[PDB]
Paper text:
The TLP Gentlyase, the neutral metalloprotease from Paenibacillus polymyxa (EC 3.4.24.28), is an extracellular metalloprotease that cleaves fibronectin, collagen IV and, to a lesser extent, collagen and has maximum activity at neutral pH. This enzyme is used to gently disperse mammalian cells and tissues and is widely applied in cell-culture procedures or for the isolation and tissue dissociation of primary cells. The Gentlyase metalloprotease structure shows the overall architecture of a typical TLP. The C-terminal and N-terminal domains are connected by a central α-helix containing several catalytically crucial residues.
Here, we report (i) a method that can be generally applied to identify suitable conditions to keep active TLP stable for crystallization and (ii) the structure of Gentlyase, the TLP of P. polymyxa, at 1.59 Å resolution in the absence of and at 1.76 Å resolution in the presence of phosphoramidon, the natural TLP inhibitor from Streptomyces tanashiensis. The only significant difference from the thermolysin phosphoramidon binding is observed in the rhamnose group of the inhibitor. The same phosphoramidon conformation is also observed in both independent copies in the Gentlyase crystal. However, the observed rhamnose conformation is also influenced by crystallization, because the rhamnose groups of both phosphoramidons in the crystallo­graphic asymmetric unit are involved in different crystal lattice contacts. In one instance the phosphoramidon hydroxy group O4 hydrogen bonds to Tyr151 and in the second instance hydroxy group O3 hydrogen bonds to Asn221 of a different crystal lattice neighbour. Because no domain movement was observed upon inhibitor binding, as for thermolysin and for aureolysin, the domain movement upon inhibitor binding observed in B. cereus TLP could not be confirmed as a general feature of TLPs. To prevent autolysis, the phosphoramidon-inhibited protease complex was first prepared in both a calcium-depleted and a calcium-containing form and both were then analyzed in a thermal unfolding assay. The calcium-depleted inhibited metalloprotease showed a significantly reduced apparent melting temperature of 337 K compared with 347 K for the calcium-containing enzyme in 100 mM CaCl2. Comparison with other TLPs showed that the marked calcium dependency of Gentlyase stability may arise from a partly degenerated calcium site Ca1–2 and a deletion near site Ca3.
Author numbering: 1 to 304
Write the structure that this text describes.
């Protein structure tokens, strides 16, 4: 069926649903084994119950965005990388919205994506930025490919890859989480890829977080890798090293290959340098502009 309704930002959009007797479920059976979207009804059981509406015009901004952006992320992965869902084999894409009460996170749990509402102050509903939905679904792709451990450098690569892909889906700017962060302040963001230190993440390896919080700083140290990606895609001069940019289209293909074909669950930043250089070489040639740019980008952020 064709359902319609507003996302978290108030924008009307359509999406596929299923008619069940007298009403409609937020379930699209036309993409792999499905895209299906649930409410946890402000408690913490997941998946919860499948969202329903009587007339197929939806009034649940969180669910409309979680569903629509899962479907858009499905299509982006098949169009851009030839991958069929998270496992490459059409794994059903399940999302739960209204997890808990004023809950300020979102997460991938090894099976589905889950989205809090936010407290209304720091965050609004998390499904409202396509680059957050991207970020969550990409943790799933990671699990099925490199299977990067969730601690120290490995866990930071895990997060940077989710930021790279989430951001690349929307391509609005170099920000992560900007649609859902601090509703009362325009222009800010949860993270910046172009300028990570703006949001207290390091952008150079000499400033690596070495404490034990946050699984050894997996959401902090990802800023190094995000900076490397940005320098490869955009170009720039940083710590004296000039990187000639190669554009997002080329950079994301190199990253996608590096993180899904070359990295393993124990990879550290140094292995990521090598995977990125290797993918650059596969795709463009050992001595190409792109393979040189892949090297400089890691030089510039101090990952040797
Ligand atoms: C895309 C972003 C909107 C959500 C994103 N959640 P994500 O990284 O998928 O998931 C989180 O981290 C993983 C490593 C754990 O496995 C998960 O259980 C979850 O804790 C994140 O960057 N979370 C950060 C930032 C953050 C979110 N809410 C916050 C509230 C306060 C401080 C920081 C935060 C974090 O948990 O740190
Ligand atoms: Ca309705
Ligand atoms: Ca965004
Ligand atoms: Ca804001
Ligand atoms: Na799990
Ligand atoms: Zn994450």
């Amino acid at each position: 069926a064709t359902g319609t309704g507003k996302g978290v930002l108030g924008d009307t959009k359509s999406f596929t649903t299923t008619a069940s007797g007298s009403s409609y479920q937020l379930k699209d059976t036309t993409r792999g084994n499905g895209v299906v979207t649930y409410t946890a009804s402000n408690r913490q059981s997941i998946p919860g119950t499948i969202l329903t509406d009587a007339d197929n015009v939806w009034n649940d901004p969180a669910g409309v965005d979680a569903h629509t952006y899962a479907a858009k992320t499905y299509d982006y992965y098949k169009a851009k990388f030839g991958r069929n869902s998270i496992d490459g084999r059409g794994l059903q894409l399940r999302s739960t919205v209204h997890y808990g009460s004023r809950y300020n996170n979102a997460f991938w749990n090894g099976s589905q994506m889950t989205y809090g509402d936010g407290d209304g102050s720091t965050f609004i509903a998390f499904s409202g930025d396509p680059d957050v939905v991207g970020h969550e679904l990409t943790h799933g792709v990671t699990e099925y490919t490199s299977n990067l451990e969730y601690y120290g450098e490995s866990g930071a690569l895990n997060e940077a890859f989710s930021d790279v892909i989430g951001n690349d889906i929307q391509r609005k700017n170099w920000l992560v989480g900007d649609d859902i962060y601090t509703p009362n302040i325009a222009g800010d963001a949860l993270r910046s890829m172009s300028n990570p230190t703006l949001y207290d993440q390091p952008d150079h390896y000499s400033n690596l977080y070495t404490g034990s919080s946050d699984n050894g700083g997996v959401h902090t140290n990802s800023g190094i890798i995000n900076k490397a990606y940005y320098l490869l895609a955009q170009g720039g001069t940083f710590h004296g090293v000039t990187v000639n940019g190669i554009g997002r289209d080329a950079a994301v293909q190199i990253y996608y290959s590096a993180f899904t074909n070359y990295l393993t669950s124990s990879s550290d930043f140094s292995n990521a340098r090598a995977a990125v250089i290797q993918a650059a070489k596969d795709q463009y040639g050992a001595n190409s502009a792109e393979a040189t740019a892949a090297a400089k980008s890691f030089d510039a952020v101090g990952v040797n």
